[PDB]
Amino acid sequence: MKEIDELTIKEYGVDSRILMERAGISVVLAMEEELGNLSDYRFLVLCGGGNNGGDGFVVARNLLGVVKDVLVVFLGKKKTPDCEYNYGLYKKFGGKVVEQFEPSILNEFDVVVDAIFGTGLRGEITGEYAEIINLVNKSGKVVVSVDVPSGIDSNTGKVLRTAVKADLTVTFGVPKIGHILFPGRDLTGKLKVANIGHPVHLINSINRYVITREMVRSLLPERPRDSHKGTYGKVLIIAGSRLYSGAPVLSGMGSLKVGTGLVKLAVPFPQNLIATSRFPELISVPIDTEKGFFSLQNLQECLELSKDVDVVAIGPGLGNNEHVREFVNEFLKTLEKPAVIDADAINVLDTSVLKERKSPAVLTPHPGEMARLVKKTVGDVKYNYELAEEFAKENDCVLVLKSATTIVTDGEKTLFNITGNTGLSKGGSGDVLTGMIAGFIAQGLSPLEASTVSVYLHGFAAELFEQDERGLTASELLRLIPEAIRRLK
């Protein structure tokens, strides 16, 4: 996007001042849409010395004469040319600026416009920058951040020591990664994305995006009327153990609720019987095991079962011991079908196996699993989209790194999912999503498409829960999936 600004100015010839005017008026219009009539409010505009501040000066100047009061506190040491020009206009128009902040100033104002730092943030915020942000955060006023809340690194969403918490953030052209990943997503509050005059071709050329309702609608497969279950694919799910008997059931129904034609589970006896007692629609094949876990002695039966399906999901509830490790790796090495690899199949995965596979794979780790898989800490991997992209590219797979914002990448294209809520923070949620992805692959979507549609619909189903989200469970999540699908069109 910094390339996008430069190109729009330097190659297309749009004056930088015109972009800056358009930016500031977008903020004014966005506030009006959010606050209603602005004429009864008093505005405190906090401007840095950069272009973010320059945007702020445009906001301030455009409120003059039209609202109850406007004051700018200019907190910088020097001004870029466009900030200087717009400061000059604000003052020519009769605007009041002060350069010294007083704790009590928040008193006489209703709205704070945060134009201190945007994408030009470098390093930790300290000093009077920090103090003013902390005063604004204690103040209880309405906070409107220009571009990105000051203190958020707009490439990562991390807080650089301290950051503004906004009610409303107005950003320009496209959402930035720091509005999408947490903690930044949290501090953004309600995000509006304004068109400020970049050519649409440049806006479209950004290679990381937010998964939207429109994108998922156009990816949903067709349901031709002359169809039968084979039309809609077959999934095998290899899952469960004597310890973890529920996982297979949730994965299997995950596949069925997204429209998959046939679902077969392979689960150790007698735990396989749990699935059909709950949903008799499922086929739950008994696997005779020595001690309640899959082992190499089940390899041959599982490949045989794999022959008559389109996709295999493996891992939920398998347990993690050495016999499971031998099985999972020898199976995936020999299986020539797309695989969705989750949970304990990730915990025991030998990543050399993924490189040698000719058939595709999707991996669905939470950060704990991703951390063990690449031998890093949870904090190194959490929201680390570049690491995710490297991993997907290096191993020829799709990586779905789960969290409140989920990252979906094949190494070239990366998508961010923002649907869902904390009712998904509970055992079982992941098991559902695994089945959904397998299901969509079986119905003919690519591994990346299947993953994109599934993470969106999984989170949207959670939001459709009628009662308090914290009471959501996986079984209720399953029942909500077909409603999410209907609301999607």
Binding site: S26, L29, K192, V193, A194, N195
Partner: peptide, 7 residues
């Protein structure tokens, strides 16, 4: 109507 804002 979506010329200015994507929400």
């Amino acid at each position: 109507a979506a010329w200015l804002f994507e929400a």
